[PDB]
């Protein structure tokens, strides 16, 4: 009411592009972690780096966090996500049950990917 926190209700094209890149970067981090674990498993079994990378059979991670992060239904990749959920986040105190993801504190660091099926 009194203070002027002039935060617009919708993002711009540049903001959307940056958000897309950030999502992609997190996806890349997850992918690299899994690949490193796979190569480590191969090297422990005896193979070397070259055919560890070229191995037809890729070893899946055995930790809960990595397995869940790799499941698309838990942490969908950027290209899998919907345009709505790329930029809008779920709020139960807002008309339409949505708010711009840029109104979340520290939104460039924290990650949101999934909202309720019917919201």
């Amino acid at each position: 009411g009194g203070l002027l926190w002039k935060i617009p209700w919708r993002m711009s094209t540049h903001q959307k592009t940056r958000q897309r890149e950030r999502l992609r970067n997190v996806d890349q981090v997850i992918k690299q972690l899994t690949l490193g674990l796979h190569v480590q498993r191969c090297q422990d079994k005896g193979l070397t780096y070259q055919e560890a990378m070229e191995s037809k059979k890729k070893y899946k991670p055995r930790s809960k966090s990595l397995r869940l992060l790799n499941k698309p239904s838990v942490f969908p990749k950027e290209n899998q996500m919907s345009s709505k959920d790329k930029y809008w986040t779920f709020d139960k105190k807002a008309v339409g049950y949505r708010k711009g993801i840029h109104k979340v504190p520290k939104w460039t660091k924290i990650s949101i990917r999934k909202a309720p099926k019917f919201f």
């Binding site: 950030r22 690299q32 972690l33 490193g36 480590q40 780096y49 504190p105 660091k109």
Partner: protein
């Protein structure tokens, strides 16, 4: 193999839990680089802070002296005394 991990985003607004996650990885100031022997423990610690770091796999590690040698720029001259 090794995870080369770089502290990309800062910690000026990060909760103390994630801040400790990072500090326990050996990472310091923003832009710091560290190589970690790949294993599930470090993998999970990095997963929990995936949004503030960059990760890439490598065969071998580089000690800070080697990283410095690779970072040093090219002096465009050769000196002969007189």
């Amino acid at each position: 193999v090794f995870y080369k991990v770089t502290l990309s985003r800062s910690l000026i607004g990060v909760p103390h839990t994630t801040k400790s996650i990072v500090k326990s990885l050996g990472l310091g100031k923003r832009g710091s680089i560290v190589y970690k022997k790949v294993n599930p423990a470090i993998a999970g610690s990095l997963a929990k802070v995936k949004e503030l770091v960059k990760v890439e796999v490598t065969e071998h590690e580089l000690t800070p002296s080697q990283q410095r040698e690779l970072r040093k720029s090219n002096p465009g001259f050769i000196v002969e005394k007189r």
